[PDB]
Design a protein around this ligand. Sequence first.
Ligand SMILES: [Fe+3]
Length: 329
Amino acid sequence: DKTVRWCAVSEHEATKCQSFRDHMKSVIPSDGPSVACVKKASYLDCIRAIAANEADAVTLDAGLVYDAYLAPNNLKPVVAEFYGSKEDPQTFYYAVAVVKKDSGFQMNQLRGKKSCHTGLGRSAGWNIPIGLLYCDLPEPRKPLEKAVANFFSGSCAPCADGTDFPQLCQLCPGCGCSTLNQYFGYSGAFKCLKDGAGDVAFVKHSTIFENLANKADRDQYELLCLDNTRKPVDEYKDCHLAQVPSHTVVARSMGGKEDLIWELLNQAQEHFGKDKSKEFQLFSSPHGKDLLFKDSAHGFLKVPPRMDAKMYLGYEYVTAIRNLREGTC
Ligand SMILES: [Fe+3]
C-alpha cells in the first residue's frame, strides 16, 4: 500500500500514465499500491524531480542510467525490463544501424551522410555508434557534439543543444527531448530515415519490425555490419553494432520506495502484461510507441539488492561511456 509517483515525459506519456492509474484502481484492492502521474518536459527533469522528492520512478535507457547515478542525483536502478519472451527473457538488446536498400555506403563511408539518433546519450542511438566512430571524427573531438556535427552533414539528435550545435537539429529543428518531436526515440529515429530526412538510423533490432508490418516493405531496408558489408534486417544477430543492457526503472537511494515500485510493477504486469487484458496494455498504447516502458518489453525483473548503476551496467559498457567522455584514441 501507497502511491508511486510516476514521472511521465510530455503529453503522450502523461495520457498513458493516467490510463495506467485508472486501470490499476479497478483491479487493485484498496490496500494495494497506486499510481499518481507527474508530467515533466524531459527525462532530465524527471531525474531532478525524483532526486528532489517530487516524483518516485521513471524508466530510462541504460546510457541515461549512468547519468542518473552521478551526483548530485545518485539514483539507482531497481527494476529492469526484459525482452524476447517470458520463456527466455533477455536482459539486453542489439544496437543496429538501419539504412535504405541500395543507398550505397558502408559503415566506413558515413562521413558526410545524414544521421537519425534516438536521443543524446542513449545506448543504441548514440553511445554505441558514436563510440564506434570516435576516431574517425576530426579533431578537435571535444566537445563531442561539435565533432559529430562536423562529421555528418546534418542530424537529428534529440536532447542536444541546438543553440550550440545547430547541425545536430538540422533534421528535427529544436532537438525536442520527448515524443512531441516526431523524430524522437526508436520509432522517431526510424521515421527520420523512412521519410528521407536522414541516410542512417541508429536504433534497436526490433525497431523495423515494430514499424513495418510487411516483409516486402522491410525488404527495402538493410543493416550496416561492422565488416563494411550490409545484411537484411532479419539478420541482426550477425550484423549488429553491439549488445546493450535493458532499460531500467530508477529510484532514490534514500526514502526511494523501491519495495512499492516492484510491488506496483509486478502486479501491473500480471494484470496488464502481454496479452493479459483487452482494456489496457502496459507495453503498447493507442497514444504512441514506447511510452513509459518500451513496446518490445515482455515484463520486469527485480534488480538485486543495492546494486549501483556501475555494477548494473557492467565494466565494459561503463568503460565505453567514460571513453567517449574523455577518451583517447
Ligand atoms: Fe535503449
